[PDB]
Design a binder for these strands. Sequence first.
RNA 1: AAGUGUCUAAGGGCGCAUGGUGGAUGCCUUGGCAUCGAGAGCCGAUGAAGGACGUGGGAGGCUGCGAUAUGCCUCGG
RNA 2: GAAAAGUACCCCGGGAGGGGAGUGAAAGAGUACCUGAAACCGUGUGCCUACAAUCCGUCAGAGCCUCCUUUUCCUCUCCG
RNA 3: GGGAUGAGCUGUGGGUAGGGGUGAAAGGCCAAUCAAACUCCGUGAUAGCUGGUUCUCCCCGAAAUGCAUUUAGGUGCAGC
RNA 4: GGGUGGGGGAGUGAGAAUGCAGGCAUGAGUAGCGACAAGGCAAGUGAGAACCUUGCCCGCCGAAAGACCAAGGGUUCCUGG
RNA 5: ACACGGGUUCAAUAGGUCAGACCUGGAAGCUCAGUAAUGGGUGUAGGGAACUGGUGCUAACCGGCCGAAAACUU
Lengths: 113, 53, 42, 116
Amino acid sequence: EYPSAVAKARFVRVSPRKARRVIDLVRGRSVSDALDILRWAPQAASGPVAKVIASAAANAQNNGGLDPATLVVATVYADQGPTAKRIRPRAQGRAFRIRRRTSHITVVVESRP
Amino acid sequence: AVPKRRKSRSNTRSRRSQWKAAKTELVGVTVAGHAHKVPRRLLKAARLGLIDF
Amino acid sequence: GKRTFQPNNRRRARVHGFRLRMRTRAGRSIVSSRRRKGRRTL
Amino acid sequence: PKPTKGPRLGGSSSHQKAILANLATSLFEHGRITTTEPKARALRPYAEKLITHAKKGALHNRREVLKKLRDKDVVHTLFAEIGPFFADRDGGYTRIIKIEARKGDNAPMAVIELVR
RNA sequence: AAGUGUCUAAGGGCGCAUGGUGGAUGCCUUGGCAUCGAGAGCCGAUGAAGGACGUGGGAGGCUGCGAUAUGCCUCGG
RNA sequence: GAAAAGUACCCCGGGAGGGGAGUGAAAGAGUACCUGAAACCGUGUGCCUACAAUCCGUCAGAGCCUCCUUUUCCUCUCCG
RNA sequence: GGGAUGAGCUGUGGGUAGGGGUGAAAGGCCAAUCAAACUCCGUGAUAGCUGGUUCUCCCCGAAAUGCAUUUAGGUGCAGC
RNA sequence: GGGUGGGGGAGUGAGAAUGCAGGCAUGAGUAGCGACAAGGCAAGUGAGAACCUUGCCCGCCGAAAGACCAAGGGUUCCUGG
RNA sequence: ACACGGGUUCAAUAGGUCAGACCUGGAAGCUCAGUAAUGGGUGUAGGGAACUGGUGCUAACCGGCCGAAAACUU
């Protein structure tokens, strides 16, 4: 029904929840609307997302031969990426485990006239 | 005061859901060359050309 | 008053150096013990 | 100028004084300052009054300006070019245009300009 | 007029489809433990065991090596 | 992975990364990699829920959803 | 706030080392732990004590009473 | 690389020991971000700059936040990337 | 925070400006007296935050989003 183009970014150093709180603004919206929204998104963690969405439309345009004007974002994932751990020293010698969480963002797009 | 019991998934996700962003945008803002899209807050700057990409 | 540790390599060498270990019968056993475990000596 | 309500800029009012004076200085020396919106807003009644003294054009007014601006070159320019030019405009010597917030603290930026 | 009267899902629940994180299970092995049999059972003031430093056409370590230094001479393979 | 044959080249992107091509039996084997479960995270979607309390179940149990037999019926019947 | 030309303070150098040292004496200090430091070995220490002891099914089915106990929160014999 | 059957032998069956090793959850996108010295503007490099560079102001210690030695650390100094 | 209330150019909401209320209490320069320190005149001056009433000069943006088209009896 929707022969969508697939694009995704693995190993991004932005947490999934911080991705999701932006992604919720771009469900069922056009690519150009999403790109403008993210351009002016005060959360300022949308950069990677705009790059991925842009690459999805560009790839659909060149490999698929589709027109961005009708290209709409269908499904967006903010999957949990690989996580490392770091030790911080706190009071009384307590060694706490502090992590650096990542994400795998998967986006599919398709013309929906 | 420390957490006595863990919170049920059905309540935790409610707290996760009441943490959303606002929606502001504006179309029709013609500038030199291509007509882009900006917010009302900054449309005057766009009209004066004080924007970048 | 608020002191914890104050290194001084000459003091460490004179106190823990294996040439001091040569002084005693026991100290020689420490070196031979460490060799058996496979560790680098002082 | 009407005193603000809430925290002074930076530390105390003395720091606010240094900020307002330096901002007014480089404003008069450049004519287009892009900074934070609160600073431009607080600056409005400050620069408006300094220019009011410029269009009055008196020795006494120069010393009242010196109470605020230790730099003298900006005073020369201010009472030599700016004042006379705005002598025919009875108020409204500035203009605030909103500017995109900074990537790093999302501070509401704004640019403050003179009419020309 | 009076009465009956489905339809909301902000956001949760359950179940399916499809992904991610993780690297458990399965199968394996450059590796080890425990034994029978057969050797050797000593090294060293001729400077032992074991080490520091250094050596390669090319940064560092391991194995080998010692200002003749990832090698020399002799008899064999 | 039997063998590096470690993804030529092109395109988004500052790069990492990804897609298209290609090697390959296979990439659903891409250096973070045989097989790849669970916790956990998340998306799409069928169904219930904003006058109502109860170890968050069990048994009765309406109405929808999905699969499906017979059948009024469409006579379009060599089809469904 | 107290001492601050003194029974002073402080660095460099050295020694006394565990049933021992030290102590203008508190049973405090001896590498963040001192009514006898730490590490290793004896050592898989021991405890009449606390906690644990992993799949199922079938038949049958107790006591918390009595005696004695450096014993009454345990155990042996008897009873079920 | 495993089944069926007759046999043999177990490091053989985990839901619990304030159990152990590893990974992820709730708490939670909460607290906190580190002496009560203070930053600001312009131009510019750069895809991207409150935080870097170069200028102009402002502020602070100044018997120390300055300038030299010892112990210690062991290249943390300079250049280029 | 949000919300509330007012206003958004037929506009006096905020800023600014002119003039006021109130406060401070006699500014600088100049001139005169005084050896000087200082004191008179110019001068109820000068400075000024919130309140008052005028004054449309700047800024309130020549544009977005969500929002009914109604199951039935006597």
